[PDB]
Design a protein around this motif. Structure first.
Motif, mmCIF file in Angstrom:
data_model
loop_
_atom_site.group_PDB
_atom_site.id
_atom_site.type_symbol
_atom_site.label_atom_id
_atom_site.label_comp_id
_atom_site.label_asym_id
_atom_site.label_seq_id
_atom_site.Cartn_x
_atom_site.Cartn_y
_atom_site.Cartn_z
ATOM 1 N N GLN B 27 0.830 -1.193 0.000
ATOM 2 C CA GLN B 27 0.000 0.000 0.000
ATOM 3 C C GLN B 27 0.878 1.262 0.000
ATOM 4 O OE1 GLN B 27 -0.678 -2.093 3.031
ATOM 5 N NE2 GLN B 27 -2.485 -3.235 2.340
ATOM 6 N N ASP B 28 0.416 2.285 -0.721
ATOM 7 C CA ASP B 28 0.951 3.645 -0.635
ATOM 8 C C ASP B 28 0.338 4.319 0.591
ATOM 9 O OD1 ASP B 28 1.592 6.387 -0.841
ATOM 10 O OD2 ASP B 28 1.149 6.497 -2.982
ATOM 11 N N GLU B 29 1.122 4.446 1.653
ATOM 12 C CA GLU B 29 0.602 5.016 2.878
ATOM 13 C C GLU B 29 1.243 6.386 3.135
ATOM 14 O OE1 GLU B 29 1.345 2.018 5.865
ATOM 15 O OE2 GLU B 29 -0.190 0.652 5.119
ATOM 16 N N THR B 30 1.662 7.051 2.064
ATOM 17 C CA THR B 30 2.283 8.382 2.166
ATOM 18 C C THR B 30 1.249 9.502 2.310
ATOM 19 O OG1 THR B 30 2.271 8.882 -0.177
ATOM 20 C CG2 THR B 30 4.160 7.641 0.659
ATOM 21 N N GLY B 31 0.068 9.267 1.762
ATOM 22 C CA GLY B 31 -1.009 10.237 1.776
ATOM 23 C C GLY B 31 -0.754 11.353 0.787
ATOM 24 N N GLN B 32 0.235 11.171 -0.084
ATOM 25 C CA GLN B 32 0.727 12.304 -0.873
ATOM 26 C C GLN B 32 0.382 12.343 -2.367
ATOM 27 O OE1 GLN B 32 2.089 14.972 1.005
ATOM 28 N NE2 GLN B 32 1.165 13.457 2.415
ATOM 29 N N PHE B 33 0.005 13.527 -2.808
ATOM 30 C CA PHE B 33 -0.263 13.783 -4.207
ATOM 31 C C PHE B 33 0.569 14.966 -4.699
ATOM 32 C CE2 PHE B 33 -4.045 11.052 -4.746
ATOM 33 C CZ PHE B 33 -4.238 10.698 -3.424
ATOM 34 N N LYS B 34 0.544 15.210 -6.002
ATOM 35 C CA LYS B 34 1.369 16.264 -6.576
ATOM 36 C C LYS B 34 0.694 17.610 -6.403
ATOM 37 C CE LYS B 34 3.747 13.443 -9.979
ATOM 38 N NZ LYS B 34 4.304 13.407 -11.353
ATOM 39 N N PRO B 35 1.496 18.665 -6.158
ATOM 40 C CA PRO B 35 0.995 20.028 -5.961
ATOM 41 C C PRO B 35 0.625 20.757 -7.252
ATOM 42 C CG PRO B 35 3.313 20.026 -5.735
ATOM 43 C CD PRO B 35 2.946 18.609 -5.948
ATOM 44 N N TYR B 36 -0.063 21.892 -7.125
ATOM 45 C CA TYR B 36 -0.389 22.702 -8.296
ATOM 46 C C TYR B 36 0.878 22.889 -9.111
ATOM 47 C CZ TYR B 36 -2.666 26.053 -11.327
ATOM 48 O OH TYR B 36 -3.202 26.694 -12.429
ATOM 49 N N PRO B 37 0.770 22.799 -10.443
ATOM 50 C CA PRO B 37 -0.425 22.653 -11.281
ATOM 51 C C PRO B 37 -0.821 21.221 -11.616
ATOM 52 C CG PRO B 37 1.426 22.959 -12.694
ATOM 53 C CD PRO B 37 1.977 22.944 -11.276
ATOM 54 N N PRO C 35 0.048 25.290 -2.097
ATOM 55 C CA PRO C 35 -0.396 24.637 -3.333
ATOM 56 C C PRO C 35 -0.476 23.117 -3.382
ATOM 57 C CG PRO C 35 1.890 25.076 -3.488
ATOM 58 C CD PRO C 35 1.484 25.574 -2.137
ATOM 59 N N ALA C 36 -0.596 22.434 -2.252
ATOM 60 C CA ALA C 36 -0.683 20.971 -2.265
ATOM 61 C C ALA C 36 -1.951 20.530 -2.926
ATOM 62 C CB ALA C 36 -0.611 20.407 -0.857
ATOM 63 N N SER C 37 -1.984 19.284 -3.370
ATOM 64 C CA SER C 37 -3.264 18.721 -3.732
ATOM 65 C C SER C 37 -4.185 18.724 -2.531
ATOM 66 C CB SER C 37 -3.117 17.303 -4.218
ATOM 67 O OG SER C 37 -4.375 16.657 -4.111
ATOM 68 N N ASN C 38 -5.472 18.980 -2.750
ATOM 69 C CA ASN C 38 -6.459 18.916 -1.662
ATOM 70 C C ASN C 38 -6.412 17.608 -0.889
ATOM 71 O OD1 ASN C 38 -8.791 21.229 -1.545
ATOM 72 N ND2 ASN C 38 -7.789 21.087 -3.564
ATOM 73 N N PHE C 39 -5.978 16.539 -1.559
ATOM 74 C CA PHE C 39 -5.949 15.188 -1.002
ATOM 75 C C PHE C 39 -4.670 14.839 -0.283
ATOM 76 C CE2 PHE C 39 -8.715 14.991 -4.679
ATOM 77 C CZ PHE C 39 -9.850 14.570 -4.075
ATOM 78 N N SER C 40 -3.676 15.719 -0.323
ATOM 79 C CA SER C 40 -2.427 15.400 0.360
ATOM 80 C C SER C 40 -2.599 15.479 1.879
ATOM 81 C CB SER C 40 -1.307 16.332 -0.101
ATOM 82 O OG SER C 40 -0.855 15.960 -1.383
ATOM 83 N N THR C 41 -2.400 14.365 2.570
ATOM 84 C CA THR C 41 -2.551 14.385 4.018
ATOM 85 C C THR C 41 -1.401 15.132 4.682
ATOM 86 O OG1 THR C 41 -1.463 12.273 4.264
ATOM 87 C CG2 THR C 41 -3.793 12.286 3.984
ATOM 88 N N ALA C 42 -1.727 15.794 5.798
ATOM 89 C CA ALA C 42 -0.772 16.589 6.582
ATOM 90 C C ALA C 42 0.314 15.712 7.198
ATOM 91 C CB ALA C 42 -1.505 17.328 7.678
ATOM 92 N N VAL C 43 -0.108 14.498 7.531
ATOM 93 C CA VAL C 43 0.646 13.501 8.259
ATOM 94 C C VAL C 43 0.687 12.226 7.414
ATOM 95 C CG1 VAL C 43 0.338 11.859 10.167
ATOM 96 C CG2 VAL C 43 0.269 14.246 10.651
ATOM 97 N N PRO C 44 1.811 11.513 7.429
ATOM 98 C CA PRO C 44 1.834 10.221 6.726
ATOM 99 C C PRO C 44 0.771 9.238 7.252
ATOM 100 C CG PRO C 44 4.047 10.969 7.176
ATOM 101 C CD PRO C 44 3.140 11.921 7.902
ATOM 102 N N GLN C 45 0.316 8.346 6.386
ATOM 103 C CA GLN C 45 -0.768 7.447 6.744
ATOM 104 C C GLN C 45 -0.222 6.077 7.117
ATOM 105 O OE1 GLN C 45 -4.208 8.812 6.750
ATOM 106 N NE2 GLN C 45 -2.517 10.195 7.120
#
Lengths: 234, 236, 234, 235, 241, 234, 235, 236
Positions: B27-37, C35-45
């Motif tokens: 699983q990707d448990e980073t919670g992370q996505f790419k920033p604008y744009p 500018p993060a994605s709205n879905f980017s969590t503040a804390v690792p999951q």
């Protein structure tokens, strides 16, 4: 494209191979940047359809439908309902066999995608274009797996990467090179297809080498196309 | 050419015999996505760690991975096979003999537990890359956790963690220079990162297993193999 | 980091303790701002993965896998099917015990998270940087609970806060202060990890005091690390 | 630590501690943070239930039974029973199973309202002692706690609490606050939620005394300073 | 405390308190907050049911029965039964189970409309006595409460309330407000609560009084002293309808 | 109160009230509010169903049976029966159960259209007698009400109403409006919905009368002032 | 009211009205409104099915059977049966149940395409009679209606209609419009477009049905009716 | 006027007898939506391919389509019918004789596999459209895949792929001039593209079937038909 030609002129096997086709998942996680819709995927979501076409076009495989298995099963219910009472117009009777089985199933992942716009540099030379015109680089990595249904072990697992420089020369016509050509389809799709087709050949090659299947003429193991694609895997 | 991680992985000392291991998702448990744009939905990290892990376990020459993501598909195929042969009418050349699904005592599972990426200028990167102190390079860091679970007992047998940090910048169209805290890659850096981490994790895993007696080497002396001690040291 | 060194140097228990590991839920409700994605969590999951690692690394616990219980179960089915007919290669035989049980299960919550960009003040003073140079403050609150499976009552419930001031000095390297040291890890990562590590130690201390479990050497109740973390807990 | 914590932890004792089952405390504010926050950032922490469980314990009036992971509990017990039913388990690894502890009352709740505004100067500035240009924050949270009779399903009690906290940052990560004076390392909105839940537990205990659900060990302690402080707050 | 609360807490007594099952009050306004709020921030608090229960209790007319968490209840009762069926439980810890209390009526509702706009000058400025450039807020909420007969499924009562509140912040976290239903009376109050909430609560409290009156008038339930039908509060709220 | 409301509450009496089951009126406009509203703010209130029930009650022609929470009802009745089957319930607390009242006709509906435009000058400015730069709004709603025969499932009636309301704010929270001048304390779009629904119920009553679905007490009163007023409106 | 409605309500009569079960008309345009609309605001109203049902009735050719809410129907019938099975219900309150009326045909459909853009001059300026710089609106919708045989599952009839409407506002909420091959409407144009399209489809349907012998006219001579031949040519 | 694809589709040579084919959905697998300022949720391509295919299969005069999308609805209606006459009381003029649902040996399915759209100026468009090189026309490209499955065995019998490219611009309100890699259209260009691709798909499919012995022509003389040969050349 070259991959389609190579794919369509392979040496023939002893007999075609039954294979059940499950999905090729898009695992890039990638979508298009502004101003695209947030929901626009970076890569087409049609890898599985392309695979079915690539497997058939190879002249090596008989793909079995599994994505729409439930629909299949319904249709067969409807047939049975239409003939169980022995009144059906004989010219309309549909003889049902058991669904064809397969010892191997094929599945896959789109494992990566990169796209950037570039100008001049190496691309401008090979294209014969101005050092200020902007071209595109598209790179896709695909993984194809063949699984043994009898044991659940992985029989074969090839990885292919295709990288394509392209630019629009006429409205809807693209010139491209595979790290020189003309294409009417979108560069990213040319890339996805070329990668999948190459993957099928990698697949066919790996299977021959591992005795999963053999050629009509074992002598033809040294076919130009087969060694070409054998060498692309070092 | 291909990363050091792959080379090391593909030249490990052999085990007494290859180990069957069942692979479920990483699983990707980073919670992370790419920033604008970027699209809000673009993941920071590729979503294909599992495929990579299956490939890395296989490439190590230590493991035979059993795919489990499509277990339900696999089982259906076996139904379809049995239905095709139960009546003894199938063309003898088309008969498919069924064995039992290969079983495994250990199950490997995992998480991408952290990711950071930012664009940088000057500093150590600029020196080692030999670029202008105004020229921009990128840093990608990914952290992976691999766990080995005993299927007979449910005890978590091993839990290794790896971090890969990769400095990079594009030198040519589609070609990157990188440093692993110099090499060239045709692959996008965050994937080079993820792959290297996963490959490293598998090596860490193998080492931990030897030490805890989960599995043994063919040649008992080769516990002091160059590659195994190399990766043993990265863990302290 | 300090938490890790200390955690790996605890005095030993009479015996390692079985504990079922269930999730540490992220209950901050928090994501990253523009500018993060709205879905980017503040804390690792990944708090749960870190808990398992911390529990093993403490050398106090034997964690039992529960997130993939259903997978476990499946593999056990597959094992039984492969050997029930007694034809399996004797060397390929896998003896199944019953899943190991535990009297306690550990669970938790990330109950709060704060992150802000700052300048001057205390950071600038202790870091020795310009009152215009920017550092980060990350603060996390964690709650760990140990529950009695026999009664459903809570056996132990510890709370930790980690606060970290940090700033980047080199590409990918941070200097930090724990409300000076250097780390290669992302600060929020270090904050979450340190809180969980500290939590397990808090837990272990509480357990000793409440007689849930015992040390080999009762005299080491006055161990340097144990008293250090006892002092933090007030 | 805040006054609420101090008060909660120094209540007069009840005749004997009360078992109470805790199911989730839902965020019913409907509120998320404004630009530039992510649309998904909740205004209020989503951890009220954990806080309630802690507050119930800390009051020394209650033994909270957690139910959020009831299904996990049940599994564990399945696994325990499967592990010893055949009588082969090493006696040192045997786990004696009791029945799950039951309770006659169930406590449940909602965070029912939240407001936050940035302020400048004004009245706060005086008790903080600063100019009409420094910005302080106002956070207000309202909570509802309900006690349900499990035997009959009657809602025995329904108390409401509001905490309002003026705060501003003085040092990086250190806050001065006033409860409509103290220092806190915790984020103000979290201090508010916590203070609200803690206060709620006391409102709950008082309301229970008044409705004859439970009484004090020492009847004199019925008019305890703390209990009376929070009764006056509740009216 | 709002007048609505004062009035609700001093109604004349009934012959006996009434059992009522409480189901949810749905937010059917469809409304969220505008930029720069999160798209997900609801315009109106999502806590009307909690308020309704409190209002039903505070009226001294009703005994609310728990239904939102009915499934949890049932579980707790299982656990209880499992704990004493083998007859070994400590006698001091024994929990006697009755059957869940029934009720012939259920109460439910909708927040059916919500309006909010910021205003300046005009009538507000006059009644507040503030500068014609200082900004105040208008909040309007409409609630519908229904009482259903469980024996027949007929809707026994369906009252509608609107509360409209002009407000502005005068001190940090203190608001001065006006109840448009008494605007010309020029009475102004102070509140520590957010205005949209005072609004919601005031509507819900009013609705319950409307509810009690309608039931009295239609013989759904009776007063202890029939003479007290002419109580000040009852006629006050009888007139608002 | 609106003209629609006055007209609905002073209709001629029917031979006897009609039981009708009320299921939802769906918002089928697909419409939400524009910037700077939340993307999620519906253009139209979501409370039409509750409005219809009130309007059906208020006509003195119908007795609505609640069906939206039918499942809750059934639960309550289980709970009642469980409380009395053992004959121990307190005599004053005994609840006699009848069968749920049934109805031969079902009423259902759709909000099929909504338009909102803010305007300036023109005809509005004239009827309002305001500055020709001052801005007013136009709100239009289309509602459909259907009555279904439960015995057969045939649709007995399908009426459609359109209400269009011009309005502008004259005092804080008070609007002047015209239906192609009056005052309302309610938001114009709600007045629009409510008025459409009230008109819809009257339309429904007329159609039912004309088709012999139900009859009025004094058959001569078919020529009632209100009934012909709304009859002419379609 | 538009040319389509006048026409639909003055068709020649059939031998007898036709039972048809109406299932949904799906919006398959994929289209929503652009900035500054809410992302969720659909380009086209979501009420095609209600409109079809109204159109089918209004044609005086069909009896629509409600199927969207069939489960509600079924529940209500359960309730009726439950209310009178014990033979105690007051006779005047007795509800005789028949079997649900069935149908040999099932009508279904899709909104298959939509365009909207603003324009100036061209054919519009002439038929509207305004200056070539003043702006009008273009709305175009394509609808597909199918009639399915329930006995075999084969498709019995399948018409396609496109209506294009040029429009612009002359008074607040009053529009000039053209049915691009002049009128007035109080309704929003994309509304008139959908509704005119659905009404046209029903006439196309009726026509196709006559020609294929799915249903018959009262008078076969009326095959050359002004309205029917008008709609024959648009096909 | 009407596209060449439609004209060609409706004048094919007849087969030995029309073929029943069951049609399930055509999925949009492009992953594509419209850019700003469109709603994020606006799809780039109409979502009505399945209706269009059903329409195309009828129009070719080779197929009798059986729609399966509302199969569940069908079944319900049949329940209702049976329940309505099982007691033998129904009015004879309202009696509905039920046959068995018609079956089919093949099932047709498909995907929209690609879509690109761009706004363009000058170039080939300006030349052939005869407009200023600053005037904007649009390019729409769609790729469709149609598959035929054997219901008796589950073998995928055929899988054809078609691409249509259309240059267009609006010349009068709601009237477009277009080019199919000049003609006039009242329909939207993206719809014309999708329809033309699907129609072409069906002819490709008919061709592939002849070639694979799935079906043959009524009139042997028509074996080398101009339309059939035309569309074979578009595939090769």
């Amino acid at each position: 494209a070259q991959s389609y030609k190579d794919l369509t002129h392979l040496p023939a096997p002893t007999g075609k191979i039954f294979v059940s086709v499950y999905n090729i998942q898009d695992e890039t996680g990638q979508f298009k940047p502004y101003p695209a819709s947030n929901f626009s995927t970076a890569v087409p979501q049609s890898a599985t359809a392309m695979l079915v076409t690539a497997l058939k076009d190879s002249r090596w495989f008989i793909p079995l439908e599994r994505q729409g298995l439930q629909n299949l099963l319904n249709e067969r219910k409807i047939i049975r309902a239409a003939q169980e009472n022995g009144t059906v117009a004989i010219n309309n009777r549909i003889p049902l066999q058991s669904l064809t089985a397969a010892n191997i199933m094929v599945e896959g992942s789109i494992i990566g995608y990169e796209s950037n716009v570039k100008s001049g540099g190496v691309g401008a030379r090979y294209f014969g274009i101005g050092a200020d015109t902007q071209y595109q680089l598209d790179q896709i990595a695909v993984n194809l797996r063949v699984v043994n249904v009898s044991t659940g072990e992985i029989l074969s697992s090839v990885n292919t990467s295709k990288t394509i420089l392209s630019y629009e020369v006429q409205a809807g016509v693209f010139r491209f090179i595979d790290y020189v050509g003309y294409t009417s389809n979108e560069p990213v799709m040319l890339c996805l297809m070329s990668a999948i087709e190459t993957g099928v050949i990698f697949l066919i090659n790996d299977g021959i080498d591992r005795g999963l299947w053999d050629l009509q003429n074992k002598a033809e193991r040294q076919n130009d196309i087969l060694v070409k694609y054998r060498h692309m895997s070092v």
